[PDB]
Design a protein around this nucleic acid. Structure first.
Ligand SMILES: [Cl-]
Ligand SMILES: [Cl-]
Ligand SMILES: [Cl-]
Ligand SMILES: [Cl-]
Ligand SMILES: [K+]
Ligand SMILES: [Mg+2]
Ligand SMILES: [Mg+2]
Ligand SMILES: [Mg+2]
Ligand SMILES: [Mg+2]
Ligand SMILES: [Mg+2]
Ligand SMILES: [Mg+2]
Ligand SMILES: [Mg+2]
Ligand SMILES: [Mg+2]
Ligand SMILES: [Mg+2]
Ligand SMILES: [Mg+2]
Ligand SMILES: [Mg+2]
Ligand SMILES: [Mg+2]
Ligand SMILES: [Mg+2]
Ligand SMILES: [Mg+2]
Ligand SMILES: [Mg+2]
Ligand SMILES: [Mg+2]
Ligand SMILES: [Mg+2]
Ligand SMILES: [Mg+2]
Ligand SMILES: [Mg+2]
Ligand SMILES: [Mg+2]
Ligand code: NA
Ligand code: NA
Ligand code: NA
Ligand code: NA
Ligand code: NA
Ligand code: NA
Ligand code: NA
Ligand code: NA
Ligand code: NA
Ligand code: NA
Lengths: 92, 237, 56, 194
RNA sequence: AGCUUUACUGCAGGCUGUCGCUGAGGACUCUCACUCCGGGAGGAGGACACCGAUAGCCGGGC
RNA sequence: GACUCGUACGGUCACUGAAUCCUGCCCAGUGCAGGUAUCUGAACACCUCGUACAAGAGGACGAAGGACCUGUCAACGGCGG
RNA sequence: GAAACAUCUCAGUAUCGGGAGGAACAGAAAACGCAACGUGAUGUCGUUAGUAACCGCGAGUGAACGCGAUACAGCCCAAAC
């Protein structure tokens, strides 16, 4: 489906309808310093490493909508439940 | 599975050892103090169990009795010489340098004074080709060109007993008798005729290797069998 | 040739004998070692914890 | 003023610099050709020896002991083991090479007892430590106040029971507080968890 | 349970880079450690190899 | 430490199985081996970011291995519609 | 055991090597950290507590300081001179 790059809607921050802008969420980069990271290095030794010896799973036929909603005025974003969509194209 | 036969060897059990105690003498050149003086006469010609070839029993001036790797044409009474300036006849032993080129040589040394390592089996002969102040190129029997220290002693002539390989063993019995005088387990059962547990080629409902016979050099012992690091195979091509 | 009865008949070789050290007939005269007290193998006497229940 | 000793000591702060460097490059050679346990008449590090309890007296012996460098010399499993327990290469022993040395030495001198030991260098494949031993039966020692204690029966075979200093240290008994819950008063009494 | 393999996961083993042993003047000379040969004088080899540590690849040999 | 008191006319590793007449075609896959502009390829050291240090992020360099290329079937095997 | 199983668990258990004593080991703070104007070597017993902490954050695993008791006990070198 196609979707407007900008449109009006409620801004949970301002508490009033403003023109928001939609962007597909870009994955942040990791620091490899979280607690989970430490445990990996800490609990991995000789032989099988339990959980840390597993590999990434598979994928669902279609992914959900992973968007960010930016408020034209205050400039703060907010998230929304997503919906399965083979592809998502923005309009303008 | 179980260790393959190739692994049972390494352990050095009776079945794999050579009947050392039944061997005669460790053939090695002499520690001629120097000068080349040393010389001696041939006494008897004995059979060397370890090599299926003859060995000349020798007695020297200092009265030291020792058996020596005997080249072809060497009889009782003959007078052998060993040193830096011995003659240039078959039998005498001297550093490569003092040896004229194009001359068939046997029982060659790798490290000067090591007693001899190269060319020393029924009929084989080495070949001194190039001379130098440093290098003494010797074409070994395998064909390779071994670059050697001119100080490495060697013997003139071809090893005795040449042509042994010409007559076939004909019957197992003969092979048997020969094998019994060597450090080897014989007869030989083919892997392909063994059970899986016993050899990487074992198993099947019919005899044939499981995977391809050519194996990597990195294969571990227990799995290195068949055609080891073969650069190619077959007669064809 | 059965491995049973018929092979019992060749057993006339002496191995274990009265032990000079512990008095048991466990001194292997061909090995010169007692399988009971360890005489001939060790100065300390042969003894293992598995010769009795763990908590005893 | 700085004791003469203080120099011997300060020199070993960096066994790889100056005179002590060349000295080592030289000794190790005569060393790599000596045995496993070599009694020597005088300590290579007088400051340390004296410090640890040495004393040019009778009944006091010294010996240099070499021990192979590296991890445990372990044999792979010949029976079923879960992955965790199939290791060989990275397994290390829980007794430091120094303690290994104190024992090899003490066994060479059955009548003596280990007083202390210190390191004296290491080439590419081995480590040398000098061990101070004591004749608990010599009257020269039975009468020396700063040492007669080591004559007590309860001091017998002290190195094999970890009473040596390097032993108590290797036993996690350094700290008296946090961290030593499973070490004091004994490893075995704490069900071997330290 | 035995057995197999391009099943899962690992562990030996082999090859390879790196660090320590290890020194003098990206290719190069050298000798003094270390190695081998020689009974020895001495020779060859030489900061490599060996060995200790680590990393990547191979790895039903287990 | 065995082989080895041995040294390629040796001995190790495999296949076939006396003699006789013979043993074709196939290197795409798998295996082994050789080469290799370029690509890919870890760690230490090195550079940048970062942090009064550190964790950590990135880069340059690049070994064996691989991609790619060649050789090889008395190598595993194949020899149809 | 985890209702499979690899980390985990069984367990630092079974078993093995070495060694002391009548008891061993520990022990006079580079401690604690109820954070204090506070405690004062060490074992042990009761409790703290199935708490904090660990863990395919699954199953399971699991202290310490302090407190009340028992018994108490403090010293010797190296070096400077
Ligand atoms: Cl999206
Ligand atoms: Cl033969
Ligand atoms: Cl002791
Ligand atoms: Cl308090
Ligand atoms: K288990
Ligand atoms: Mg791991
Ligand atoms: Mg035999
Ligand atoms: Mg020989
Ligand atoms: Mg033949
Ligand atoms: Mg056969
Ligand atoms: Mg069969
Ligand atoms: Mg198999
Ligand atoms: Mg057949
Ligand atoms: Mg076949
Ligand atoms: Mg039977
Ligand atoms: Mg005093
Ligand atoms: Mg206790
Ligand atoms: Mg089963
Ligand atoms: Mg040698
Ligand atoms: Mg298996
Ligand atoms: Mg047949
Ligand atoms: Mg279960
Ligand atoms: Mg579960
Ligand atoms: Mg536990
Ligand atoms: Mg505490
Ligand atoms: Na940990
Ligand atoms: Na087979
Ligand atoms: Na002792
Ligand atoms: Na611990
Ligand atoms: Na079975
Ligand atoms: Na092919
Ligand atoms: Na091919
Ligand atoms: Na179950
Ligand atoms: Na099961
Ligand atoms: Na776990």
């Amino acid at each position: 489906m196609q979707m407007p790059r900008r449109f009006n809607t409620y801004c949970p921050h301002c508490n009033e309808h403003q023109e928001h802008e939609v962007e597909k969420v870009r994955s942040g980069r990791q620091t490899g310093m979280k607690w989970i990271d430490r445990q990996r290095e800490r609990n991995s030794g000789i032989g099988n490493d339990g959980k840390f010896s597993k590999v990434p799973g598979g994928d669902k036929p279609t992914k959900k909508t992973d968007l960010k909603y930016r408020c034209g005025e205050c400039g703060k974003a907010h998230l929304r439940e997503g919906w399965r969509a083979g592809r998502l194209e923005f309009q303008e | 599975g179980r260790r393959i036969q190739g692994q049972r060897r390494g352990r050095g059990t009776s079945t794999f050892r050579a009947p050392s105690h039944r061997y005669k003498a460790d053939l090695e050149h002499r520690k001629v103090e120097d000068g080349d003086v040393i010389a001696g006469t041939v006494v008897d010609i004995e059979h060397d169990p370890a090599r299926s070839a003859p060995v000349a029993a020798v007695e020297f001036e200092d009265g030291d009795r020792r058996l020596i790797l005997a080249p072809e044409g060497v009889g009782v009474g003959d007078e052998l010489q060993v040193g830096v300036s011995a003659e240039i006849a078959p039998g005498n032993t001297l550093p490569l340098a003092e040896i004229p080129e194009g001359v068939p040589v046997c029982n060659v040394e790798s490290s000067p004074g090591d007693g001899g390592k190269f060319a020393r089996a029924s009929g084989v002969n080495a070949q001194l080709l190039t001379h130098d102040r440093n290098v003494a190129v010797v074409k070994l029997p395998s064909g390779e060109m071994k670059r050697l220290d001119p100080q490495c002693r060697a013997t003139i002539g071809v090893v005795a007993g040449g042509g042994r390989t010409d007559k076939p063993f004909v019957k197992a019995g003969n092979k048997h008798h020969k094998m019994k005088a060597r450090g080897t387990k014989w007869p030989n059962v083919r892997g392909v005729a063994m059970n899986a547990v016993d050899h990487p080629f074992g198993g099947g409902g019919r005899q044939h290797p499981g995977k391809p016979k050519s194996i990597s050099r990195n294969a571990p012992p227990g799995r290195k069998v068949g055609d080891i690091a073969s650069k190619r195979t077959g007669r064809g091509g | 040739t059965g491995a049973g009865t018929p092979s019992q008949g060749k057993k006339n070789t002496t191995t274990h004998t009265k032990c000079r050290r512990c008095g048991e007939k466990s001194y292997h005269t061909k090995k010169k070692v007692c399988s009971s007290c360890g005489f001939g193998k060790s100065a300390k006497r042969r003894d293992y914890e598995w010769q009795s229940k763990a908590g005893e | 003023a700085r004791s003469a000793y203080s120099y011997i000591r300060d020199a070993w702060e960096n066994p790889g610099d100056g005179q002590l460097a060349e000295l080592q490059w030289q000794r190790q050679q005569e060393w790599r050709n000596e045995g496993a346990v070599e009694r020597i008449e005088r300590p290579t590090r007088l400051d340390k020896a004296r410090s640890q309890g040495y004393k040019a007296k009778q009944g006091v012996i010294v010996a240099r002991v070499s021990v192979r460098k590296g991890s445990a010399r372990k044999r792979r499993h010949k029976a079923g083991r879960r992955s965790k327990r199939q290791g060989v290469t990275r397994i290390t022993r829980r007794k430091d090479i120094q303690r290994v040395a104190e024992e090899r030495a003490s066994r060479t001198f059955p009548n003596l007892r280990v007083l202390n030991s210190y390191s004296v260098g290491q080439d590419g494949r081995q480590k040398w430590h000098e061990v101070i031993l004591i004749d608990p039966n010599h009257p020269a020692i039975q009468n020396d106040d700063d040492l007669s204690w080591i004559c007590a029966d309860d001091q017998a075979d002290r190195v094999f029971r970890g009473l040596t200093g390097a032993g108590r240290r290797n036993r996690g008994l350094s700290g008296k507080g946090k961290g030593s819950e499973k070490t004091r008063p004994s490893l075995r009494s704490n069900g071997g968890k330290g």
